[PDB]
From Swiss-Prot, chain A:
Processing and modification events after translation: Phosphorylations by PRKDC at the C-terminus of XRCC4 and NHEJ1/XLF are highly redundant and regulate ability of the XRCC4-NHEJ1/XLF subcomplex to bridge DNA. Phosphorylation by PRKDC does not prevent interaction with NHEJ1/XLF but disrupts ability to bridge DNA and promotes detachment from DNA. Monoubiquitinated.
Shown segment, full-protein numbering: 49 to 144 of 336
Domain of life (superkingdom): Eukaryota
Family (UniProt): Belongs to the XRCC4-XLF family. XRCC4 subfamily.
Name listed for the protein in its UniProt record: DNA repair protein XRCC4
Reported tissue expression: Widely expressed.
Localization per Swiss-Prot or TrEMBL: Nucleus; Chromosome
Outcome following mutation: residue 34 to E: In SSMED; impaired ability to repair DNA double-strand breaks
Swiss-Prot record, chain C:
Subcellular localization: Nucleus; Chromosome
Protein name from the UniProt record: Non-homologous end-joining factor 1
First-to-last residue of the parent protein present: 1 to 224 of 299
Record's miscellaneous remark: Was named 'Cernunnos' after the enigmatic Celtic god of hunting, the underworld and fertility.
Protein's GO biological process: B cell differentiation; central nervous system development; double-strand break repair via nonhomologous end joining; immunoglobulin V(D)J recombination; positive regulation of ligase activity; response to ionizing radiation; T cell differentiation; telomere maintenance
Organism from which the protein derives: Homo sapiens (Human)
Stretches the record annotates as Globular head: 1-129
Impact reported for residue 13 to A: Does not affect ability to participate in V(D)J recombination
One GO cellular component term: fibrillar center
Coiled coil: 122-164
Protein encoded by which gene: NHEJ1
Impact after mutating residue 24 to A: Does not affect ability to participate in V(D)J recombination
Phenotypic consequence of residue 99 to S: Does not affect ability to repair double-strand breaks (DSBs). Does not affect interaction with XRCC4
Listed result of changing residue 117 to R: In IMD124; likely pathogenic; abolished ability to repair double-strand breaks (DSBs); abolished ability to participate in V(D)J recombination
UniProt keyword Chaperone, yes or no: no
Result when mutating residue 65 to D: Abolished ability to repair double-strand breaks (DSBs). Abolished ability to participate in V(D)J recombination. Decreased interaction with XRCC4
């Protein structure tokens, strides 16, 4: 939770922006100037994003993770979700 | 530092928009600190702060939300952007140090900013609570005197015009025979509550910052 | 009875007579002491003393004196408007304690008595350096604004008289169509830099003390 509070004063703009920035970093989306630079150290399993400007680095957002013992697990989960939604899209589309 | 003190000497007053106390502030927010000299009408101050003390004052009231020093500085620079020059203002007038309880929000979690003004010593007051304030005040007194004598001579011309021609034109901007003392007394009736009870001070700033632009001579 | 501070919000600004740099040592001498808020617009002092302590101060600083405390109380009441209470006054504008020397001399053997205006209370500093000074500054500014209205009306009166007939024949001493901003633009660059003259309080009692007394209400 500590990685979710002080980052707004880093990015230093007022409220509202920070929560949406965190969510859109977690979800899909990244701005060109409001970029959530995905500083995810793959091996050490730590994700953070900093929108640095104005005389010092601005840690816009940080979100630690916990590396899965078997990498293939959630990858297979996500890709099987993608293929399931692909098949659903094609079948519904023909009915469309 | 002295750069921020001088900028305060040139950059104008601007009342803290809290609608609680007459915290008439002088806005000069430039890098390596700022100068927001805030007076509460019951104590004197001189917030000639630099970025380090700016950030440590920002941290002194913060508990869980923090930032790098320059991050704090530019954050508080952005803080005045929508309202003064994050548009939430408050303070505690009782405190000896003017702890401007500026509760601007950045995360949806509480952030605590105070425009903590250093208590102005009787030698510190002369920098900005007197030299620009009394400079523009004496300037306004000279303005009143000069405008009064100009009104008197223009009314002499006007009376010469009636005595040479009895034409009446509009009777809507027809001036009364002007008296400086009568003007001052009639002003001490309705605008005195504006004067003595400053309240906002917005009439002070948007009408005397023109004098502030060139009161920095001293 | 806290009338020292109440007498220090309406405190008249009296120009102290010195053999040195004269400051605006202003006080409301009471039968229970006084409050000498020395406000020369350079450094602010305050003698928050009761009648007993100041009277015993005089008795102890008078080397061989047999006088009642009421005698020196009247001696102080002679400084109710701090012009001359006796010898000639002399301030010590070096620290937060102003030594206002009053040599009790009537052609005898050596004497030396002086005041001790310890650190000025910032509340009453604002009561004569910020709050009613803020008030009289805003009052003078909106006075200049109402004078802007008055000047504009007189200018339009003179002008509309000129093109409506009976124009004055002395073209070499008339005035062009005037406006307040034409006065303010020249003021900001000529008089405002020089009307910004803080001085040793004397600029206050020549131009600011009167309207201050007009705004001592709060």
């Amino acid at each position: 939770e500590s990685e979710i509070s002080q980052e707004a004063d880093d990015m230093a703009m007022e409220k509202g922006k920070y929560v949406g920035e965190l969510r859109k970093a977690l979800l899909s989306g990244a701005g060109p100037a409001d970029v959530y630079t995905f500083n995810f150290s793959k091996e050490s399993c730590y994700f953070f994003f900093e929108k640095n400007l104005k005389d010092v680095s601005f840690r816009l957002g940080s979100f630690n993770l916990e590396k899965v013992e078997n990498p293939a697990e959630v990858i297979r989960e996500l890709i099987c979700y993608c293929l399931d939604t692909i098949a659903e899209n094609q079948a519904k589309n023909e009915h469309l | 530092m002295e750069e921020l003190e001088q900028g305060l000497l040139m950059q104008p007053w601007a009342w803290l928009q809290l609608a609680e106390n007459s915290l008439l502030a002088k806005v000069f927010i430039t890098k390596q600190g700022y100068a927001l000299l805030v007076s509460d009408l019951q104590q004197v101050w001189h917030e000639q702060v630099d970025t380090s003390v700016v950030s440590q004052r920002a941290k002194e009231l913060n508990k869980r939300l923090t930032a790098p020093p320059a991050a704090f500085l530019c954050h508080l620079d952005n803080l005045l952007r929508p309202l003064l020059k994050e548009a939430t203002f408050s303070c505690d007038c009782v405190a000896d140090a003017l702890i401007l309880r500026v509760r601007s929000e950045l995360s949806g979690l509480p952030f605590y900013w105070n425009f903590h003004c250093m208590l102005a010593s009787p030698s510190l007051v002369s920098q900005h609570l007197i030299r620009p304030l009394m400079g523009m005040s004496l300037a306004l007194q000279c303005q009143v005197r000069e405008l009064a004598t100009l009104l008197h001579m223009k009314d002499l011309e006007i009376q010469d015009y009636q005595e040479s021609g009895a034409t009446l034109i509009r009777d809507r901007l027809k001036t009364e025979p002007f008296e400086e003392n009568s003007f001052l007394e009639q002003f001490m009736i309705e605008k005195l509550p504006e004067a003595c009870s400053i309240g906002d001070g917005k009439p002070f700033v948007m009408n005397l910052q023109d004098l502030y632009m060139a009161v920095t001579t001293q």
